[PDB]
Symmetry: C2
């Protein structure tokens, strides 16, 4: 079947199994896809969303090792626009409102976040080896 | 050229860029390879090496998302033996003594660990946002 271009974006700080599963899901939305992943800039992430440990370069270099990722846009724009979709020939945006125009255009595909598998979740498990008392 | 079977093993706790770079290096030792990765058991790792946060199943499930990994042996034997190499048709073992017989057989290939890129290194960077005084 025809190849389908999928776009996902995010911070991908401290990349963990939850990111990987959501990238796999986006890659597998159709039988033949190209998965483009956008990685948000340090300045815009901190200004608009919250704290980020790793630099853009670190977050991007880790992401390239993930088998589902076919292309990376680093940094990506903070806000997806129709012109951006046209420039990269994107058929669907995969994400878990401001996506209203994407759904109106038929270009939205839902993916899911997995709870309890994050990198900081692992550090909490380490800390729980040390009793309060 | 002929396909070359490479074996690497380890704990792969809290998988990070350093593991990924060492897997990439093992995968790229020759132009055409199959990279088999062995993941050590929880009990043997803790008994012989040290603490491990994630279970065998978690460490294995994260590893499968890495593009360089072609096969996983989970759990792998704590000690590599000649019979193990024969069973899996392994041409080279990639690792960073007890590898003496591997070098004697011509089946040893060095790879490098990267410093300063581990998951716990990232947590140290988080903690450094909070001044001692």
């Amino acid at each position: 079947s025809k190849n389908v271009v999928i776009y996902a974006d995010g911070v991908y700080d401290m990349l963990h199994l939850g990111h990987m599963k959501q990238l796999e899901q986006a890659k597998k939305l159709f039988e033949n896809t190209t998965l483009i992943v956008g990685v948000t800039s340090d300045n815009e992430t901190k200004l608009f969303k919250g704290q980020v440990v790793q630099t853009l370069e670190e977050r991007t270099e880790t992401l390239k090792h993930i088998r589902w990722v076919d292309e990376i846009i680093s940094p990506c724009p903070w806000v997806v626009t129709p012109e951006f979709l046209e420039k990269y020939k994107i058929d669907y945006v995969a994400h878990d409102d401001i996506y209203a125009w994407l759904k109106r255009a038929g270009k939205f595909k839902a993916t899911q976040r997995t709870e309890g598998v994050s990198t900081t979740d692992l550090i909490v498990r380490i800390l729980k080896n040390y009793e309060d008392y």
